[PDB]
Paper text:
Slow bee paralysis virus (SBPV) belongs to the Iflaviridae family of nonenveloped single-stranded RNA viruses. The overall structure of the virion resembles that of picornaviruses, with the three major capsid proteins VP1 to 3 organized into a pseudo-T3 icosahedral capsid. However, the SBPV capsid protein VP3 contains a C-terminal globular domain that has not been observed in other viruses from the order Picornavirales. Furthermore, the P domain contains the Ser-His-Asp triad within a surface patch of eight conserved residues that constitutes a putative catalytic or receptor-binding site.
The two structures are similar, with a Cα-atom root mean square deviation (RMSD) of 0.27 Å; however, they differ in the positions of protruding (P) domains of the VP3 subunits on the virion surface. In crystal form 1, five P domains related by one icosahedral 5-fold axis form a “crown” on the virion surface. The crowns have a diameter of 90 Å and protrude 50 Å above the capsid surface, giving the SBPV virion its characteristic shape. Residues from loop β2-β3 as well as the N- and C-terminal loops and β2 of the P domain interact with the BC, CD, and EF loops of VP1, forming an interface with a buried surface area of 850 Å2. P domains within the same crown do not interact with each other. In crystal form 1, the electron density map corresponding to the P domains is less well ordered than that of the rest of the SBPV virion, indicating an increased mobility of the crown. The P domains are positioned in different locations on the virion surface in the two crystal forms. It is important to note that the domains are not held in position by crystal contact in either of the crystal forms. The crystallization conditions that produced the two crystal forms of SBPV differed in terms of solution components and pH, which was 6.5 for crystal form 1 and 4.5 for crystal form 2. We speculate that the differences in localization of the P domains might be induced by the differences in the crystallization conditions. The GH loop is exposed on the virion surface in crystal form 1 but is partly covered by the P domain in crystal form 2.
Numbering used by the authors:
A (entry chain A), D (entry chain A), G (entry chain A): 6 to 185, 188 to 246
B (entry chain B), E (entry chain B): 1 to 91, 101 to 261
C (entry chain C): 55 to 329, 331 to 393, 395 to 413
F (entry chain C): 163 to 215
The structure:
């Protein structure tokens, strides 16, 4: 009884005429997605530390299966319809070995923004943390880490590719959250991404809005097929 | 049956042990079977193989399920694989082909034996899930509807039939430790679960139904066997240089 | 030898009940015994007899092996089951080397040795050919010729356990008798010829260390009841071995642990003889007729000892009782005279007559 | 189900290394025995007839399966341990066609001894009979029978070979004793052997001791294999 | 079973008679089968063979064994072979292929038929012993442990199965007499038992066990068949020149 | 207990220098540094231990 | 430093002229000995059991290294000069695999004598035991054991060869005496030799004298060289 096993088939008809997945439509349909989906919201002045210099504003844990969904009334895109395709696709697999592409949009600022990547940092958070409320010794820009400095006067969307730097055979996706091992902190996430502002100058009254979109890469692979966890229909989100 | 002897029964022979079967199996493989090549890239020490000991088929547990406890989804056995450590108190024992060594790796094969009568009906489903204990939806994937989508074998109680589940090595290490390295903080270097490659699931697909007679058997025993195709050990230490902690059971 | 010891012999069967809620569980020991060519006496069909020898129905491999000192090779144990298609089970029979009992023997330990798992699913017969795992090349027989007070030990132990308890139904027998059978493997060999550890059951009569009274001497039998001119002018009865004068049947070495006041009884084949008037003071009187020899009293005359016959009758036992007591107190020869009379000679015995205190 | 039948073998190991029956030892072990075992005891003067001339002292019935065992206290070799190998070997077979070798030892005499063989004499006795107590017209030396006359001054052990002279297809061994047929008296035994003393001179006071040992021959064969009768262990002859 | 008809049943055909079987047999041969060459050395008269009559399979007896009488060792049939003489009073009858002739010889084949239900268990053991009636330990060799070492066939009651036992001619004559020569003394020319080549043993290897139901059969019938491969007769006399004595039964 | 692992026995008999090249026995391929940039409150652990007796 | 090791030789002269071990004498001198040496003494009537029939008179344990020496004044050959060559030769070795030759002389009897060999009998005695004082169930003639029956009227010296029948790799010589293992009872001695008299007739008044001489065989070998145990000089047996 392999996962695909037909003991005695009673097929009354011939098969349906073969299409290619791109004929009566013009694209090849297979399970690969570089479609970009959201990851976070907005920040205000009252969130940042008293000394906001070389201090990151966001601590983003890197998970192929996305972040732990949290419904708000300010953000209906999480509440009325669940998280995007990517985390539901990764829910049917166990391991990954590729890097992720990050597209980041910062709208309330016209001043320079930085983005740094910390591969070896243990991914023990399932939600992004902002400013003052960020753990100390975190959201401090490091020196010798992969980074990208961009001016918002030129372009206010940052596109970078986060590499796969894990000292292991695989990368674990769909990791539990609260209480450990040595496989949940160094082998699950690609690490953390720190987003900060070059200047220590105060945040505009209206505040700043950071929308992080991400996609899969080419050297990325969903290695082992697991059973699908029971899903929730978005169509029944009103009763 | 039809001979002065019984019917001719198929045989399976490994090192120093022989298993007998009478009917057709129900099999499946966890993932694509292969040959480990990055394991020699993890240890400078020469690996060791013990075919005469590791290729042996071993019987580790036999569970009984009765009609009164047979309900859809009833978990007959839910343990972390591979963990076959048995000792007088809750405490890997050197009494069998088991080694007190730091690191190891191997491919596994699980055989489930059930011996019912010609007059009973029911279904068991034996599945396996790679590192299911580490998933945030573990307790949620124990339902047979979810077990059907994982690599699994089916047991019919209306036919006496055996089943084998090939489970090739898959892990993130790629050498799993047999014992603990306990000196670490919860934030960095969390405690490592020894030999936790996954979770072996057997459950009730169809409630065990017997005859309504009093003199009829209402309980059936489910016995299990496990074997290793090729084992490699690369951590040589004193049997008591590191110690074995009480296995942390994880039930729902 | 390879032809003979290849023939299957039957061992002591046992019942296998599925209704037993205690013995029919996963892990229980159903059957076990030491592994050697000869079979353990308690695993063999036996036929005992009072005051006789126990008879064992030994298999071909066992009888032959009892003719040789050492032995080696695999042994083939065939298990026959009295079941039908409805019955179902699984047994784990193991071969534990270096063990001879089940003091520390369990299922969860038997799996750590050479074993096999048989299924009882429409199967009535199978064989478990056990290996020959030994520290040495040849193995001495467990049982042997009387020479020492200790039986040698078997090299290994075979044990049958329960994996999946036997299950039957309402319309089927809950009991399934199991019949273990033994034969020698193709690699079985027997080393050196020695004193048979077996004997024929044609004659199970034996003379144990039980104080049997020695059947005269060799050459002094057959015997018959006759007369002796130096014994009360040949009017009384004694056991002769020859018609020629001075030919009285002499007894062998009587052990010194026998009571002086004791008389004897025939314990084997005996003879019939015709023989006394009423004695003064008592009602002891023997009517003239033919009686079967049963009791007897020893008459010593120097270094030679003879025997005096007494009829197998409640009266004769008491007369020989007193005669044995009178000789113990050195009573006058003329006073002990009123001893059976001599009427005529009697038929000769087939061979030696045995006696007992 | 032939006598050797293995329906379903579960052999966990390979076979044991083959030895030849004569390698770790130096003799070839098969079921053939020319080992000599005892058959009788001693005789005194008072046993022989009044006219002991051309009158045999012993009437020995010839049986491959030996004589009917009779335990005595004077002879412990029969009592503590049962009869020798030969009668236990013949107990697993039904027929024989060969002759027997007889070695006879006479110790209390230094006078000539004779041994004669009577093939056609019906073997209806299971025990040897001595002197006076021998049936008349028996233990009378015959004229034209196979015989051997030997002087005890030269050698006091007689070795002869008794031939197989039966008017039948086989020779029956393990014959019952007391009440018949035509197969139990002329087809079972090789006949009778008569042992006598050339002279009529009286037997020495100490008496004479005759020990008869015997063995199988080459033209001898155990033809049909029968089941083994239940045996008795010699090791339990004290309780 | 699986057809509009029953399953296909094997057939065995000899002269003027056909036997039907449905399952696999259990067979064995008494001794090395051969071709008689010293028999022509016993009779000056030409031998006679009656293939059409002697090759026929005959049914002679059918015994019933119930659970209450089924014990280990229970002798179901113990008769001197070959003796199949059946007449109105206890008195060889000319009603079948049987001849009133002085001498004869032949090889025999014994087939045992048993027809049980799908729900019973037990074992029968049919053995043969050449001239067992003449052994001093006859009554001692009737126990199934001793029957296992003699040429024998096994019958399973948990499977419907037939069995055949080939018994080649073995005797000391080599022509056995069909009738008596009674004029002889016990010391010389003892009375000769007509046609006594051996003893056919069937017994209970495993007690006949049935269902505990009242409407269930508690008795099973064991039928027997006998046949002769090649028969030779060399003694021609009047049917009443010699007479048949009452068969001396020999039970323990 | 140290004799039950990868070890070496050096003699100090007119010898002043020697090297003990220790292996890399790990459950994984690469091993994280024990000490690192201020980011967490815990120093990672070394894969093995060297002892001189 | 092998057992033969010469570090720095200071040889002032040439070697002595080579002889062959058989030139200035005519025999080849190497360490092999079929020289026969004594093993026991004499027996009287009062030593034998009440029923001396098929009851052996001597129970001789078979040891290549001879028996345990016991000095008597009746026997000076043990007292003034120690045991013969054989046990001093075997003292420098550990294992043997051959059989032994036994020459046995019985002088006070003119009646038949028997000798039997029991290979599998455990050799747990270091001294021969006689008659009544022999352990029961021992010194009882067995049936199927290698034996030799000889008449003293023909020849009063018995020469037999006892075989090597041990279920092991070697045969252990120089075995300890009193308190065990499984190597000291079945792997040390060739077994026991039983010497008895065919008749039950009383022993002559003068008694009988049994002298057992023995030698090594060809299939015999002293396998492993051990150090020599300290010896005793026979020349100092008077002070």
């Amino acid at each position: 009884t392999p996962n695909v096993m037909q003991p005695t088939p009673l097929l009354p008809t011939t098969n349906d005429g073969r299409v290619t997945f791109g004929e009566a439509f013009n694209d090849l349909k297979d399970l690969a997605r570089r479609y970009q989906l959201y990851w976070e919201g907005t920040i205000l002045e009252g969130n940042l530390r008293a000394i906001r210099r070389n201090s990151a504003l966001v601590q983003l844990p890197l998970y192929p299966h996305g972040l732990r969904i949290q419904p708000d009334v300010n953000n209906p895109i999480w509440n009325i319809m669940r998280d995007g395709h990517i985390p539901v696709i990764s829910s049917g697999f166990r391991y990954f070995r590729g890097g992720l592409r990050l597209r980041i949009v910062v709208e309330g600022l016209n001043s320079c923004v930085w983005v740094q990547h910390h591969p070896d940092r243990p991914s023990i958070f399932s939600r992004p943390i902002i400013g003052r409320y960020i753990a100390a010794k975190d959201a401090y820009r490091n020196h010798a880490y992969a980074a990208y400095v961009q001016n918002m006067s030129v372009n206010r969307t940052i596109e970078v590719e986060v590499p796969f730097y894990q000292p292991g055979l695989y990368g674990m996706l769909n990791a539990s959250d609260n209480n450990t091992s040595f496989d949940r902190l160094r082998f699950t996430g690609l690490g953390d991404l720190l987003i900060g502002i070059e200047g220590e100058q105060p945040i505009p009254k209206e505040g700043i809005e950071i929308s992080v979109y991400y996609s899969i890469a080419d050297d990325f692979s969903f290695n082992i097929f697991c059973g699908f966890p029971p899903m929730v229909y978005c169509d029944e989100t009103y009763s | 049956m039809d001979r002065p002897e019984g019917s001719e029964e198929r045989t399976v022979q490994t090192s120093n042990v022989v298993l007998g079967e009478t009917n057709i199996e129900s099999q499946d493989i966890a993932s694509k079977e292969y040959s480990p090549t990055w394991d020699r890239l993890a240890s400078s020490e020469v690996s060791d193989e013990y075919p005469m000991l590791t290729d042996r088929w071993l019987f580790w547990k036999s569970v009984k399920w009765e009609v009164n406890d047979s309900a859809f989804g009833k978990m007959l056995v839910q343990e972390k694989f591979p963990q076959s450590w048995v000792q007088m108190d809750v405490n890997i024992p050197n009494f069998i082909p088991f080694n007190i060594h730091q690191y190891m790796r191997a491919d596994f094969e699980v055989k489930i034996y059930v011996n019912p009568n010609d007059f009973v009906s029911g279904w068991l489903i034996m599945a396996f899930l790679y590192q299911g204990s580490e998933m945030f939806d573990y307790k949620l994937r124990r339902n047979p509807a979810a077990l059907m989508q994982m690599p699994h074998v089916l047991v019919n109680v209306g036919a006496a039939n055996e089943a084998t589940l090939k489970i090739p090595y898959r892990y993130v290490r790629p050498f799993m430790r047999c014992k603990d390295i306990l000196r670490g903080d919860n934030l960095i270097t969390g405690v490592t679960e020894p030999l936790n490659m996954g979770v072996l699931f057997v459950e009730v697909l169809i409630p065990f139904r017997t005859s309504a007679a009093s003199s009829a058997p209402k309980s059936l025993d489910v016995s299990l066997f496990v074997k290793m195709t090729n084992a490699k050990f690369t951590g040589m230490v004193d049997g008591s240089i590191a110690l074995l902690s009480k296995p942390i059971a994880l039930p729902e | 030898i390879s032809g003979i010891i290849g023939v299957y012999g039957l061992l002591k069967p046992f019942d296998w009940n599925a209704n037993d809620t205690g013995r029919n569980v996963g892990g229980h020991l159903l059957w076990s015994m030491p592994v050697h060519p000869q079979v353990d006496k308690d695993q063999v069909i036996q036929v005992m007899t009072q005051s006789k020898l126990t008879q064992y129905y030994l298999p071909p491999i066992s009888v032959v092996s009892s003719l040789y000192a050492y032995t080696r090779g695999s042994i083939k144990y065939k298990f026959l089951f009295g079941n039908n298609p409805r019955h179902n089970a699984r047994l784990l029979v193991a071969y534990i080397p270096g063990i001879s009992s089940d003091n520390r023997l369990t299922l969860e330990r038997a799996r750590n040795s050479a074993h096999v798992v048989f299924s009882l699913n429409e199967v009535s017969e199978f064989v478990f050919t056990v290996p020959y795992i030994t520290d040495t090349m040849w193995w001495p027989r467990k049982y042997g010729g009387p020479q020492a007070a200790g039986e040698f030990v078997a090299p290994s132990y075979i044990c049958m356990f329960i994996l999946n308890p036997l299950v039957a139904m309402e319309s089927v027998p809950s009991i399934v008798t199991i019949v273990p059978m033994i034969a020698a493997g193709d690699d079985f060999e027997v080393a050196v010829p020695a004193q048979p550890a077996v004997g024929l059951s044609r004659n199970i009569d034996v003379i144990y260390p039980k104080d049997s009274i020695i059947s005269f001497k060799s050459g002094y039998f057959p015997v018959y009841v006759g007369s002796w001119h130096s014994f009360f002018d040949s009017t009384k009865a004694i056991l002769r071995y020859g018609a020629v004068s001075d030919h009285i049947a002499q007894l062998g070495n009587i052990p010194a642990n026998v009571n002086r006041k004791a008389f004897w009884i025939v314990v084997g084949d005996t003879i019939k003889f015709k023989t006394l008037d009423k004695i003064n003071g008592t009602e002891w009187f023997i009517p003239e007729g033919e009686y079967t020899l049963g009791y007897g009293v020893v008459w010593r005359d120097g270094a030679y000892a003879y025997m005096v016959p007494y009829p197998l009758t409640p009266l004769g036992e008491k007369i020989a009782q007193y005669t044995a007591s009178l000789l113990a107190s050195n009573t006058a020869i003329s006073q002990i005279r009123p001893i059976p009379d001599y009427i005529v000679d009697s038929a000769a015995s087939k061979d030696n007559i045995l006696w007992s205190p």
